[PDB]
């Protein structure tokens, strides 16, 4: 399977006035780990991040080409892009490749740059968007992640409880997947700050 070639997992999770996005740090080629600090979550704005699991080459290409489009949009418009509008932009970019798609399934997490309202979504690899009020997952251990999120997530969590929940969902999910892990990174997005942490995590 093309999507299991590099492995990897991302999720995002909604809280009261905040969002969280997380990712494993492994870059591998089938069984072989190459690197343990590979970037999968990319800033798209001060309070808006995109996480991409899938084929590593397209994780990078989609991030880069999305950035191209985003920078032009912001220079041309007056303003920072809204979360929903970033989703539509990504959707449009992936659907252009409908008959030969990028092998990545992004997740978006952010706050609206005026309201600061929490937003999360994910998209399939041809750009079907999917907005939710709880959590989204993407990657080789999606079933593991669904198990953890459906059992732990609660509404209206504060930044500290949201951090613990997303961290526990990631660590325990990826510990049941051979080709995801070698570290987990978590971003908590608040109105007034970004908290970025790497977790103590299994390295096998």
């Amino acid at each position: 399977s093309i999507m299991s070639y590099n492995g990897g997992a991302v999720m995002a999770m909604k809280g009261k006035n905040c969002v969280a996005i997380a990712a494993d740090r492994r870059f591998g080629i089938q069984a072989q780990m190459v690197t343990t600090d590979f970037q999968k979550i990319f800033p798209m704005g001060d309070r808006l991040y995109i996480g991409l699991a899938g084929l590593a080459t397209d994780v990078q290409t989609v991030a880069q080409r999305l950035k191209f489009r985003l920078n032009l949009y912001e220079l041309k418009e007056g303003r920072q892009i809204k979360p929903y509008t970033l989703m539509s932009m990504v959707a449009n970019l992936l659907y252009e490749k409908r008959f030969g798609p990028y092998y990545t399934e992004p997740v978006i997490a952010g706050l609206d740059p005026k309201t600061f309202k929490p937003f999360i979504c994910s998209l399939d690899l041809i750009g079907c968007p999917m907005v939710t009020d709880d959590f989204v997952v993407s990657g080789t251990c999606a079933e593991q992640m669904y198990g953890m999120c459906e059992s732990l997530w609660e509404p209206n969590m504060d930044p500290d409880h949201l951090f613990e929940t997303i961290s526990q969902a990631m660590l325990n999910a990826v510990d049941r997947d051979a080709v995801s892990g070698m570290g987990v990174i978590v971003h908590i997005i608040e109105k007034d700050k970004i908290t970025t942490r790497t977790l103590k995590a299994r390295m096998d």
């Binding site: 399939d124 690899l125 041809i126 079907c128 999917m130």
Partner: peptide, 4 residues
């Protein structure tokens, strides 16, 4: 690919 998601289906309905």
């Amino acid at each position: 690919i998601i289906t309905x």
